[PDB]
Design a protein around this ligand. Structure first.
Ligand SMILES: Cc1ncc(COP(=O)(O)O)c(C=O)c1O
Ligand SMILES: Cc1ncc(COP(=O)(O)O)c(C=O)c1O
Lengths: 387, 387
């Protein structure tokens, strides 16, 4: 290993994951890593600070080239550089496109259970969430394609926020899955917002199919959203990119970003994202080895010692989605009890809606010692409910 | 001098002010400085990068306490910390509050000539600009109070965006003026948005009266917006703060910031803004003397060498508002010609509406060597018109 995946970075006091924690508490909930970032990214940030003045910045061509090269090398899918639009973050970008591309009262389709912020930005903006729930049978989720299409074909359903890879279940959709969803959207004149923030984190030999790769019958109805945030542990960098093949939709999205105040990079976003996308390949390769090892440990350990929970098969993300239905306890109550009894803090599934009240979500992007600790604490919590 | 005000910071290529220039061009248009930032802010950024991991961050109580301390020490006007809400930018905060507190088609009052982004955020959001124009007589601007009140009393006039100190004329309103405008707004149930981003840059012995200091007859109708960005040359830091005494308005504004994606700090906003507001007093004191020296130089040089222009008397900001009406040329025509013939790039006043076509705006926040160069180029451009 050329990089450090053993030492937990010591945060300042306002960290959400680590701030204000009792002693020995173990946070494994919010989706950020307990690894130092790639030193090539750190080098770029430290070089930028040498300017020692931080006035207004433009988005350089080098930024879009870096995004396009990254998508080509890592995902065999090069976007055209002119498809790319900087935004300060994925969820702010979705929020702006909700306002620009739908009207108040319109419905926006998601596939529950899904990332909670999708509901916040839809409902907070005065749009209405509609779900084609994922079907859960035999420890696997699947799409009810007829229901999905009937909902997309509804006149007031105007946008689909598609989570690709899907958070929290950790599923990188197949090529014909993505192509089918895009064709359904296009046929029914629905804009497909493809949130691909987990796209660099496919752990099997499968890979992401970005929405921008679908053929031109449908490519004019898609937006791909990417960011180095999840991949490189850079949530607070506020650097993202919308990839929008449709030139007019693209320009409208850009204008909505500027009006909302999310179209201009902060003092680090451009050099740091360029460094990640140009020089982060080796660090990501080693990261995936660590994550595969951590998932292998969690799956082997919970299969052997905690048969009352079921880690779902997932091919993407560093988040494990764990069926706790056999405990007969609402996930929020269980997570509260588990924290009080063991100090382990994991995410209750309820906020993802769908059938999330039967699940917990566990963040495995930390050093293996923390994974070993956390799994034992989860075992302790499950078996002491038995008493 | 303890600090460096002679060396221009060496920017990277994607700078709005210094990027894409031709040989020997001298930019003095956009409002950012050509000074290094205070070393106390610089160190806080360098130390924060050492965390080497940038996940999610809360806004700590210490941020609002630093805002309160700064306002108390610099302006003798201590806001209650509970009034304060982080936002990533002043103009984005105005944009969010336009959408939250007015309806499409409603009128929003400004005082022309005024900062061009006021028009952008009002009209881009589908609201209508109404102006109570500042009256311009004898090289000074004044308020038509009857006209202002008549417009505020119009039912469709729902918000006033108040520039305090006023850009581009560089005028810090008197206490009586701020209180009078606030009471007019409250009397007619108009929300007063007081943009105080220039409030730390009063160059005379006068000071700003922040809107949040008005008495409670009217304090429930005001929002004060502040930021270290103008004061400390931190446009790209994306740290600002709304001060909203009314708790119901405060709750609604805070939710609007979160929905727009401007309510959460990037990786540097918190420690850098805190260092600025806790340790930037001495640097700002030295900056103000450098700015006064540059304004003194420019006024004396232009009075002696270019009597065809008149630098207006101003008490705030580092932007000179220069009456070019004696040149007999539209400011946009003059500034184009000036850049072509001399390479000096200043702002045409046309974008500020009002009587801005008779003015240019010149940024004096740069080393004296650049002020001398810029003044000579401006003289040469004036000289070459009647040749
Ligand atoms: C599916 C998904 N989208 C978006 C985000 C957050 O993205 P950003 O912080 O750039 O807004 C997350 C959280 O990591 C996520 O899981
Ligand atoms: C009056 C005024 N308001 C707002 C701004 C922009 O501030 P921010 O970048 O924090 O949105 C400026 C830029 O100098 C300004 O002059």
């Amino acid at each position: 290993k050329q990089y450090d995946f053993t030492h937990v970075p010591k945060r300042q006091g306002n960290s959400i994951k680590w701030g204000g924690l009792k002693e020995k508490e173990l946070p494994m909930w919010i989706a950020e890593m307990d690894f130092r970032i790639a030193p090539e990214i750190m080098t770029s940030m430290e070089e930028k600070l040498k300017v020692a003045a931080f006035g207004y910045e433009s988005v350089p061509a080098e930024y879009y080239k870096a995004v396009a090269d990254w998508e080509e090398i890592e995902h065999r899918a090069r976007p055209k550089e002119d498809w790319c639009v900087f935004a300060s973050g994925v969820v702010p970008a979705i929020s702006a496109m909700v306002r620009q591309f739908t009207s108040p009262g319109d419905q926006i389709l998601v596939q529950e259970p899904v990332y909670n912020m999708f509901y916040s930005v839809i409902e907070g903006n005065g749009r209405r969430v509609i779900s084609s729930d994922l079907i859960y049978e035999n420890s696997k989720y699947s799409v009810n394609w007829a229901d999905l299409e009937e909902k997309l074909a509804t006149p007031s359903v105007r946008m689909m926020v598609f989570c690709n890879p899907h958070n929290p279940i950790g599923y990188a959709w197949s090529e014909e899955e993505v192509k089918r969803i895009a064709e359904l959207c296009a046929k029914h004149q629905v804009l497909l917002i493809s949130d691909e923030i987990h796209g660099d984190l496919v752990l099997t030999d499968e890979d992401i199919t970005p929405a921008f790769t679908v053929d031109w019958d449908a490519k004019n109805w898609v937006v791909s959203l990417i960011s180095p945030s999840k991949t490189f542990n850079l949530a607070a960098l506020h650097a993202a990119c919308a990839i929008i093949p449709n030139p007019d939709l693209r320009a409208r999205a850009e204008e909505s970003f500027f009006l909302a105040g999310i179209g201009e990079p902060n003092l680090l976003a451009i050099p740091a994202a360029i460094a990640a996308y140009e020089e982060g390949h080796n660090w990501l390769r080693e990261l995936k080895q660590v994550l595969r090892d951590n998932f292998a440990y969690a799956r082997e350990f919970l299969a052997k010692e905690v048969p009352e929970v079921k880690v779902l098969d997932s091919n993407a993300s560093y988040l494990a989605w764990v069926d706790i239905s056999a405990l007969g306890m609402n996930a929020e109550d269980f997570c509260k009890y588990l924290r009080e009894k063991t100090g382990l803090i994991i995410s209750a599934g309820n906020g993802y809606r769908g059938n999330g009240h039967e699940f917990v979500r566990i963040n495995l992007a930390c050093p293996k010692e923390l994974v070993i600790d956390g799994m034992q604490r989860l075992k302790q919590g499950v078996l002491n409910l038995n008493n």
